[model samples]
Target: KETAAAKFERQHMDSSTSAASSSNYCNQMMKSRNLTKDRCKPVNTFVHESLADVQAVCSQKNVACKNGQTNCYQSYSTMSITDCRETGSSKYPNCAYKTTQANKHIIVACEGNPYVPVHFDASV
Candidate 1:
């Protein structure tokens, strides 16, 4: 039998939208937390890895965002993971392929001095 987390990871991978941060949901957080105009600032973005990571932040923001009972971001199609062909030598190119997927929208707000991730509406 698969564990609950394993099931969630499987389900998350199959989904286009993430487990947190809707465009609308994130926008609100960004605004409320005054976390706009910040990027490439060492983000440890893990979707289904940590629960408290998203929950605590969202909870503090006081938004309508909820945990588990919500979808993450904009709706999108599935993404197929190809392969990296070749092996032999230490580093070789292997089964390479193209990837395509529908558009996904998301917004996020961070907290703390260094601006740690808060949360968003990532259910889907």
Candidate 2:
């Protein structure tokens, strides 16, 4: 059977039919990348949309997701978040989220290794 992290990785883009479905098509693009939640291995959350996908991973712990009040991201259906909020959400509402927001929406400072970026499942 699939695992929880697998469930998270496979949750959004992989399973459009899940609680994490979005019109943005995160479901299709992510599946196309042949990615799993593990795609973000070595990195727990992709902070600083300022960083490249690969670079962001390099500074994972140091990079703090910024904060913004705007609709950084929406998760009504899928996981939507802004760079500013990513950090706090990760631990927010519950320990699961600190920033109370998702960083998927913001354009961050660096990009890391995967070149594919695990920060916030980008839509293409």
Candidate 3:
């Protein structure tokens, strides 16, 4: 079974390609990254920064998790991110997504001994 941390990495971490040149990136990535299984995740985000940099966000500003958890933090700086939003007409097995690039402070939930990011709560 995939842990939350691993799941976060799969769904949100993208250090190599930051620039979303084509509109189909979210469509392609959502499928290739396995986020299209069962049903399309309505929204998701991929951080373009290094994994280490993203993990370090746990040490930034304290914030409440969307689910009301207290182990969440917000990045101090705006980051390069690609937001994936599933289209309303997107049917399962044909999950279509809209890709948008943005620079925003990201919020993440962290856990474990090292206290690294486990969930991408939001980008504000």
Candidate 4:
């Protein structure tokens, strides 16, 4: 079984890129990361930061989760991120995406003993 930390890394971490450049990033990543299976994930974000920094967000801007669960937090400092949004022309089994990069405070849901990120709520 994958731990929450591991799952987070698998789905949202992309350390090697350092920054977003090429246009095909989302198309390649969404598929290679297995997020496009069955159906394309409507949205997802890849954080280009260290694990410790991302985990520390749990103690940052205490806020409400998207569904009002009240366990979300916003990053105190802007982070390098690549936002992957499903394209309007996208369809099942052929997921397409628009990728954009920015330095922004991200919103995330946290959980567990150490209280690490469990879900990427949004970025703003």
Q: After superposition on all CA atoms, how large is the RMSD of candidate 4?
A: 1.5
For each predicted model, how many residue pairs clash, with residues at least 3 apart or on different chains? Answer: 16, 40, 0, 0
For model 1, residues 1-124, the per-residue Cα lDDT tens digits are 9543343333222233444333243233222323233421111122433433432333342333355333223213222221111223312111111122223332233344443343433422
Candidate 1: what lDDT?
0.30
Worst 10 residues of 2 by lDDT: 69-78
Off by over 4 Å in 1: 1-63, 68-100, 118-120
lDDT of 2 by residue, 1-82 (tens): 8543333343222222222223323323333433323442212222222222323333332334345322122222222331
Q: Which candidate leads in TM-score?
A: 3
Using lDDT as the yardstick, the better of models 1 and 4 is 4
* Candidate 3 residue lDDT tens string, 38-119: 8888898989999999999999999999899999999999999999998879988899999999999999999997888998
lDDT value, residue 93 of candidate 3: 81
Q: Specify the poorest-scoring 10-residue window by lDDT in model 3.
A: 13-22
Model 3, residue 111: C-alpha shift (Å): 0.2
The C-alpha TM-scores of every prediction are 0.20, 0.21, 0.95, 0.90
In terms of TM-score, how similar is model 4 to the real structure? 0.90
Indicate the residue-level lDDT of 22 in model 2: 38
